[model samples]
Target: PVILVSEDEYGKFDESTNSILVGKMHHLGSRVIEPGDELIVSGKSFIVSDFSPMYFGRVICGLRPGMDILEVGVGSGNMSSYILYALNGKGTLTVVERDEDNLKKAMDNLSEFYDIGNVRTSRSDIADFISDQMYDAVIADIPDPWNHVQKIASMMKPGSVATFYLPNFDQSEKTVLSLSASGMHHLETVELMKRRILVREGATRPASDDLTHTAFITFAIKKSGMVYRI
Candidate 1:
């Protein structure tokens, strides 16, 4: 007669399938993990260089190498960390923070890299920061991009990209209209969601909880020769 394993034995069997061999696990452990470092997590290999917390990751992922970026809000420095990583040590970042505490934290988080020249910080309202100087990309993760969309759009060079993190779909549409009215053309809208799963012998299941609806990303590029409209 064939014998059936008990529930405990079955559980052990399931775990064994997902478990890594001790030698293989140790080999991975020896490596130091740094921001922008890509590693496999939950069957996906994501670049570790961008380490923004889940809420801010949506904004940081859009940055590209060799682009100069300007960030309107510098809360907690989480978003700043990810931007630096996405730039791959090539681009420059100018962050504006009205809150003194947040600005200090942003500087602290950025100090790890000795090349401080690449990152610059200013204490001022985002609207006031916009000037004749233009950036390759601009990001606004503040309460209301509508209030300054016109001014901000004017500061971007022709074909430069801009992104805003809206709290909801309603805010997203409003931001789009504001940018459109300012002569900026909408390119894309993206929402990022992340979920972790457990893989076991012959079965895969998602974790009980996951992050949902952090924010909506609204993208647009400045219209050519629109600087005069400001």
Candidate 2:
């Protein structure tokens, strides 16, 4: 998505110009916005969503085409976009979000590329969500996945996978432990660190900055039959 860079705030949809009018400039559409480029709106920093760490969460989910997927939170549509790409127009994606603005922003941004017909949205907390439809995979991006481990377990089919994106070890540990008590098979927990290398003619070396940490992702599978405590 292209962002308009301007000193003053302005926004009005102008279809004739195929751009949005900002304070004094138009939000022109372009083809090349780098992954690390910053999108500043109203002088506030909007975090870029394509960091590699987000991909780890999607990979851990082991997504496949024609598999129904559920996403707990839609933060800037990062992980959601990854899952949609993996599904490749063969599966359905349902996103449950508690914040109206965050959900709106995610759908608005996603609608630009993907056909949103396959995407369903619910503006409710996980605790309040009621679904008879079990998913092939579930993603928990909320702050307290451990607290809703049982609920998440109930929404999955036997052998279905669930992945949690937690910011720290404390939450990740709690989430996996809770999964054990919730009749889920804890598979693995991992953290990804990204280091950029600048390939130069004579000054080839690691970049000055490195993303040492982002979040911990824990993957688990649903287990059926009698609950066993571990």
Candidate 3:
């Protein structure tokens, strides 16, 4: 999806007009908008998940069609959109957010892209979230995930992947430790970095501000520790 970004504002594109609708609409009138082009929105900025890290976290989960997916922390449904795309509208996506506003905003944002029929949402604390449904993969973006690793592990199916989005070294390290101790086999922790190139004539180079270090993604597989032999 294309983003409508301006000198001051950044948000999704308005599909009807093929432009961004701010106060009264501005710039690139009917011109086709591409990835690198910037617009001028007459509003303040809003927070959502960035492009690269969200894609990285979704890919790390190994999501598949018809598999059950759980996403903890729906911040405007940015990451949830990516997860839903990975699921290809086949599997069920269950999301939990503590704040009602956040859940509502996510629902609004996600509805533009896919049908909300298979999407399940809850406005409750992760500690209070109990489910009989076993999930194939889990994507968590909450703070202090170490506090809920055991609960997350119990809801995951064996050999299923669980990816955590931690923004600091301390959080990543501690979460990895907690995951390994909570019946999860720690796989890898990654800090993905991305850069944009300025393709000016005879001046093509990387952009001055690099999109670096959004979060450290910690991936692991749930191990039930049950063995069968002949």
Candidate 2: tens digits of C-alpha lDDT, residues 10-94: 1333334434334454343533333223344445422112222323433233677898999999999988888888889998999
Off by over 4 Å in 1: 1-65, 199-213, 225-230
lDDT of 3 by residue, 1-230 (tens): 23432223345555356644444554334444333232323334221111333234322345567988999999878888888888787989999889999899889988987888999988999999989999878999999899999999999876566889988888999998887578676657888666655556677455554445367888866665542111
State the C-alpha lDDT per candidate: 0.60, 0.68, 0.69
Backbone clash pairs for candidate 1 read 35-49, 36-48, 36-49, 37-48, 37-49
TM-score for every candidate vs. truth? Answer: 0.62, 0.67, 0.67
Candidate ranking under lDDT, highest first, comes to: 3, 2, 1
The candidate with the higher TM-score, 1 or 2, is 2
Candidate 3: the clashing residue pairs are: none
- The 10 consecutive residues of candidate 3 with the worst lDDT sum are 45-54
TM-score of 1: 0.62
Stretches off by above 4 angstroms in model 3 are 1-60, 199-213, 227-230
lDDT string, candidate 1, 1-230, tens digits: 01101101111111222222211231133333332222343343222222212224232235678888888998777888888878888979999888888898778877875355788888988877745568877888888888888888777765456788887888887887776677566656777665554446566444454434366898765665311100
